[PDB]
């Protein structure tokens, strides 16, 4: 990638210093801390300024990788992102794991308009550690699960539609908090937006043939 083209959101947020709002506990990679979510509310913000770079790198790629772990509760419904407007409530963007429906939700607000499409088949509310790799440019989505599992959806509009300038002035980005009632359940580790890269890449490096 180039420069600030790798962000580890719970790094950005400092939550593995803080102590409140999740326990660290071990995941799959053996490097890094994994966080099982305790209250979401408690877990801090992403800063506005490393918000700001995120934005910026996903307007130039009109994209994004989003990689993570998670081990998620059964039957659950968990958002693993979400984008908050700083107050005039509501979000702007989110990432859930739907274990209700079997789906990965990708919400996108424009213009007070909320526009929603599921991947389906992406039953990630497992008792398991899975991995995912979702890749967004444009208005598609194709999500990775683990290595042999590929689903797609489109949007209704396109990913920078959402990503404007000073997006930070008017939302910022929490981490395993949604909203209402759809705070991530369960562990996560390594939920990080990674730019320059396709999927292909991050597969190959993660040991898939």
């Known amino acids: 990638g180039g420069d600030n083209s790798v962000f580890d959101i719970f790094e950005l947020t400092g939550a593995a210093r803080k102590g409140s709002g999740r326990r660290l506990v071990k995941g799959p990679d053996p490097s890094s801390p994994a966080f099982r979510i305790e209250d979401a509310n408690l877990i801090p913000p992403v800063p506005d300024d490393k918000f700001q770079d995120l934005v910026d790198a996903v307007r130039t790629e009109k994209g994004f990788l989003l990689l993570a772990s998670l081990r998620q509760m059964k039957k659950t419904r968990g958002t693993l992102l979400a984008l908050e407007r700083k107050d005039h409530s509501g979000q702007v963007f989110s990432v859930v794991s739907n274990g209700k429906a079997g789906t990965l939700d990708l ?29 967004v440019q444009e208005d598609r989505a194709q999500l990775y699960i683990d290595c042999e599992k590929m689903e797609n959806a489109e949007l209704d509009v396109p990913i920078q539609s959402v990503f404007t300038r000073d997006l930070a002035s008017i939302a910022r980005l929490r981490i395993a908090k949604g909203g209402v009632n759809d705070n991530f359940q369960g562990v996560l580790q390594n939920v990080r937006f990674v730019f320059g890269t396709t999927p292909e890449d991050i597969l190959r490096n993660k040991g898939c043939s």
């Open 107 to 135: 919400s996108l607000t424009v213009q007070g308009k909320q526009h929603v499409v599921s991947v389906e088949e992406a039953l990630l509310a497992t008792g398991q550690w899975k991995s995912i790799t979702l890749f």
